[PDB]
Amino acid sequence: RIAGVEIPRNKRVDVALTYIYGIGKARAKEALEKTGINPATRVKDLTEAEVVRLREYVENTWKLEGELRAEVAANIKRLMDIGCYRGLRHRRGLPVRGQRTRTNARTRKGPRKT
């Protein structure tokens, strides 16, 4: 379908685009504009010339699914290499952005270990 995945036909293209990893409401709200595509049309409600327009466009606008995940892990990979404090947090798998490490770090630490 599109760059990495398929959009849900019964859903409008707006949320469908955002289903692409590497695309939120913003780029979803924009690529339809640069491709002049009506967002209200469901994914099943999409013509080929529209999609190929949008497909080639968005696929040529931003790295979305795989290439994006490359740099993401890459950015954290390169962090872990230099040994920055941030890299320390990742290599420790602890809250990287100054969160209160003592409590409420389950999102970074997962299950509890009492």
């Binding site: 390169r78 230099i82 920055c84 404090y85 420790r92």
Partner: protein
């Protein structure tokens, strides 16, 4: 982050020392109390014992640490787990 409208803050005396050893070539391992500065591309190839609160921790400056603060690579806290 520091506003790019504002200059890249770097502790001048430490920065100046780096520019000094540049003329004098890579040598004179620099102890620094100046955790807060950002590494400058000149600083690459140098080394600094960055002060960690009690100690000056030696850090070799590579290009992978240019756009960062000095103190980042000096972990001010020592953690080892529990038990």
């Amino acid at each position: 982050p520091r506003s790019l409208k504002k200059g890249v803050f770097v502790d001048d005396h430490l920065l100046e020392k780096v520019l000094e050893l540049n003329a004098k070539g890579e040598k004179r391992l620099i102890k620094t109390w100046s955790r807060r500065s950002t590494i400058v591309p000149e600083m690459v190839g140098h080394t600094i014992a960055v002060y960690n609160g009690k100690q000056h921790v030696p850090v070799y400056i590579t290009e992978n640490m240019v756009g960062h603060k000095l103190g980042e690579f000096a972990p001010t806290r020592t953690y080892r787990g529990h038990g």
